Paper text:
[name] is a spliceosome-associated protein that binds nuclear localization signals ([name]) in splice factors CDC5L and Prp31 as well as the antibody diversifying enzyme AID. [name] is a widely expressed, highly conserved 62 kDa nuclear protein that associates with components of the RNA splicing machinery. [name] comprises a HEAT-like domain (including a nuclear export signal), a central armadillo domain, and a coiled-coil C-terminal domain. Our results identify [name] as a unique selective NLS-binding protein with striking differences from karyopherin-αs.
We crystallized full-length human 6xHis-[name] and N-terminally truncated 6xHis-[name]Δ76 (to generate a fragment that is necessary and sufficient for NLS-peptide binding). We were unable to solve the structure using molecular replacement and therefore crystallized selenomethionine-substituted protein for experimental phase determination, solving the structures of [name]Δ76 and that of full-length [name] from crystals with the symmetry of different spacegroups. The overall structure of [name]Δ76 reveals a superhelical coiled coil composed of α-helices stacked against each other to form an extended configuration, in agreement with circular dichroism data. The structure can be divided into three distinct regions: an N-terminal pre-armadillo (PRE-ARM) domain (residues 76–176); a central compact armadillo (ARM) domain with helices tightly packed against one another to form a solenoid (residues 177–416); and a C-terminal domain (CTD) that projects out from the smooth solenoid of the ARM domain (residues 417–562). Residues along the central spine of the solenoid and the CTD have low temperature factors, consistent with their role in stabilizing the core of the molecule, whilst N and C-terminal regions beyond the CTD display higher B-factors for solvent-exposed residues, implying greater flexibility. Preceding the ARM domain is a region (PRE-ARM domain) comprising 6 α-helices and connecting loops, which do not form the ordered triple helical arrays that constitute armadillo repeats. As in HEAT repeats, the [name]Δ76 PRE-ARM helices also contain conserved hydrophobic residues in the buried interaction surface of the helices where they mediate intra- and inter-repeat packing. In order to probe the NLS binding mode of [name], we generated multiple mutants of [name]Δ76 based on the crystal structure. Strikingly, all mutants retained the ability to interact with the CDC5L NLS3 as judged by a pulldown assay. Thus, [name] likely recognizes NLS ligands in a manner very different from karyopherin-α.
Residue numbers in the entry: 76 to 563
The structure:
Amino acid sequence: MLDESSVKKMILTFEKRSYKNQELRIKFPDNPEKFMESELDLNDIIQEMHVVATMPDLYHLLVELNAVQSLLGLLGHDNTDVSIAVVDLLQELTDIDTLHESEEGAEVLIDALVDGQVVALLVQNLERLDESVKEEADGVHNTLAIVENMAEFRPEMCTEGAQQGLLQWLLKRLKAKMPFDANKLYCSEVLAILLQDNDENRELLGELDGIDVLLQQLSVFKRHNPSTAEEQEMMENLFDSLCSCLMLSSNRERFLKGEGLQLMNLMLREKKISRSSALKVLDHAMIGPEGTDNCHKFVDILGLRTIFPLFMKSPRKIKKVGTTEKEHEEHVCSILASLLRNLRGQQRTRLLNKFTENDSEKVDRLMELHFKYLGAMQVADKKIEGEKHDMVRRGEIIDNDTEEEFYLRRLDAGLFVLQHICYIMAEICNANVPQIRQRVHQILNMRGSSIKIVRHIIKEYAENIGDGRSPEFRENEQKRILGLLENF
C-alpha cells in the first residue's frame, strides 16, 4: 500500500507533466521530437495513477489539486494514446464497486465530472477515434463503460448526458454500415439504459429520427434468425429501447409513420425468435388512447388474422424460447383489450366479427381463459386470507409492507390478464349481439362462476386504473368502464 502523502505527490507529478506537455505541444508544434518524451511520461503517470482508485477515500485529493479538470482537458489532447489512457483511468476511478466503498469520495468526484461536462468531452473523443484500429475500438468500449458506471450511480445525469451529444452518437453508431461488433452490442445496452424511465431522452430520441434507426436495425431479423448469442442480445436490447420509447404518447405517431406496425406484424407471421418481442411491441404501440391510430392501422394491414390465431393457441416453442405461456397470454389479451377500447367504425365491426365466427369459438376461448386465471386468483386470495389469519394468531400487525407482498402474489397469479379478460367480456357483451351475450351467460351461469364475480373484478380494475396518467383521466376512464356494467 501507499499513503495520503505518497498519493499527493503522484498527482502533483501528473499536474507537473500534464502542464509541461501542454506547453511544449503549443511551443514546438512541428517537431514531435521536442515534446514526445513529455508525452510518454504523462502516459506513464496517468497509467500509474490507476492505483488511486484502490483507495476511493482520497478522492477530494483529485478535485482539490485540480487533477480532474486537467484530466478532461486531456480527453481533447491531439493524440489518441493520451486521450485513451485518460479514459482507462476514468473507467478504473469510476468503477461502481469502488464508488460504493466511500460515499464522500464518490460524491465529490461525480460532482467534479458533471461540472466538467464529462459526457460532452467523452463524446468529442469518440467522434475522433477509429474503430478500425484495435486500441481505439477498446477506447470506445471503455468510454461506454464509464457512462454506464455513472448512470448506475447517478441516473439524473442521463438527461444532461444524452443532450450533450451522446444519444446522437449512439444512434449513428447503431446505423453505421459496419459489421456486427462487441461495441455495437454495447451501444445497444447503453442506449436502452439512457431511456429507462426517461421521457426527456425518449423524446430526444424521437426528434433525432431514432425510431427509424431502431426499425431498420430490428428489421434485419424479420425473416432470418441472428447468428450468435451476442447478436441476439443486441436485438433484444433494441426491442427494449423501442418499447421504452413507445411509453411516450409522442412516439406512437413516429412508430406508425415508420411502418413499424407492418414490421412487427411480418415478424409475427414468420414465427422467428423476434416473435415474442414483436408481440410486446405491438402491445406497447396500442395500449391507451394514444394507441388509437395504431389500433386502426393494425386492422387495416390485417393484424386481426395474425393475432387471433395466437389468442386461440399459445405457441409450441415455449419450452425453448424463454417467454412463458402466461406472458404470451398477457399480451394478446392486452392487445385485444386495447382494440376493444379504441376501435370504432369498420375496424371495430371486423373485430367484433371475430367473436361470432364460427359459433362464437373465440368466446369459448375467452371463457376458457377466464376460468383458468380466475381459479388461480382464488387460490392466491385464499392463501392470502390464510396468511392473514396466521398473522393474527401470531400477533403480527399487517402493514403496507405486508400488503405489497400480497399484491405481488396476485400479480404473479395473473391479476392483470384476469382484469383484461373481464374487460374484454364486458365490452363484447355491450356490442348488442345477442349471440355473444347468450354464450357468456350460458357458459357463466351453468358452471361455478357468476356475473357477480366478474362485475366485482371490473370494479377493482376501474378503481385502481389509470395509475399512470392525470387526475382527470383516472376519473374519466373509471366512468366509462363502470358504464359497461349497465348492460352486463
